Amino acid sequence: MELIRIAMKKDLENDNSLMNKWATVAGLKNPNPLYDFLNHDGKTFNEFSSIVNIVKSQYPDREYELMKDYCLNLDVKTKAARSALEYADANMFFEIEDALIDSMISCSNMKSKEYGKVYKIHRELSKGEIDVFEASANIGKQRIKTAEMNIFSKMLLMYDCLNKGNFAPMMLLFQQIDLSEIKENRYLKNSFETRINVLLSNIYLNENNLELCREYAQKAISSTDTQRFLVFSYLTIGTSYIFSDFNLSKQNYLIGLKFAKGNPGFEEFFKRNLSFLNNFWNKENEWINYDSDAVTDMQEVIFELINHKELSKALQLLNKLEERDQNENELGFHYYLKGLITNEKEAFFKSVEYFKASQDKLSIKMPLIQLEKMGENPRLLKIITM
C-alpha cells in the first residue's frame, strides 16, 4: 500500500468529516471515487489534480515524500502515470521524473512511451548531455502523435533558448502552440497553461514590455501552487525592475528567495540576480559567489572589482573569461564589463551587437547609456532600441 493511502485511512478513522473535505478539494461530484481509491489497489482518479489537491491540503509538509511513493507505485501505462510525469517535471522533482521516464520508455503503452521519450529529451538537453541539434533530431525520430508532446517538444526548445541566451526563437515557437488541442488531460492542460504564462512573462521581459511581463507572471502566481512556477514568476518580476526600480527589484527577489528556501538550485537564481542588481546600482554586495567557475558568477566578481576601482585586477579576471565558452547574452555582459574597465567604445558596440543577436531588448540599455555618455548620436541610440 502507498503511504498516502495509509495516512488517509489513519486520519479518516478519527474524523469522518474528512471524506467530504477531500471530495470537495479533489473536485469530485460525490465521495465514491475516493472510497474506491482508499479501498481498491490501483484505482486512480480521473484527474490527477484529485490526489495532488488532497496531499497539498491535508499533508502540505509531506508532499514530496508522499507523492514520490505514490508516483513510483503507479502503473506506468495509465493516464495517471502520464500526469505524474508532468507533475514531477513541472516541480523539478528529478528523482521521481527520471524513474517514471525509465519505466515509461520500456512499457507497452504507446502514449506513455511517447511521453517518456519526449520528457527525456528535455532532461538530456537541460543537463547538456545532448545539444539542440540532437534534441531536434530526437523529436523528429519520435514521430510524435499526441497534441501534448507536440506542444511539450516546442516548450523544451523554448526552455533551452531561454537558458542559452538565444531569445529570438522563443516567440516563434510560442506561435506554434495551441493548448486547445489538448483534450483528454485537464491536469496537464492546466499545468501547461502555467508553463506558458511564465514563458510568456520571460518573452515580454526580453522584448522590454515590462507591464506585460509583470501581468503574465502575476497570472501564473494567481493560478498555481507549484513552487517552481512561483519561484520563476517572482524572479522574472524582479528582473523587470532591475534597470528601473531598485527597491521593487530587490523586494521581488527577496520574496522569490523565500519561496525558493531549501532548494539550492532555485535559491541560486535569486543570489545571482541580487549580485547583479547590487553591482549595477553601485551598492556593497553580499550575494556574490567567489568560489564558482560559472561565467555569470565570475562576471559579478569582476563587476564588484570595477565598483571598488580595482580595474587592473578586473581586467586580468575578464581575460580569463575570454578562454571560456559563453553564450551570446553572456557575451553582451562580458563586453559591457570590458567597456566599463577599458573605456573603449569598441567594447560597448560589441555589447550592443551581442544583445541584438540574443534579442535582449532589456539588457541592451546598459551599453547604450554608456555610448550616449561617450558622445554617440542619441537619435541613433534610440533607433537601436526599436
Binding site: 522574472t236 540576480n273 553582451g332 555582459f333 539588457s363
Partner: peptide
C-alpha cells in the same frame, strides 16, 4: 550577468 528561468 542576469539569469532567467521559466
Amino acid at each position: 550577468g542576469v539569469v532567467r528561468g521559466a
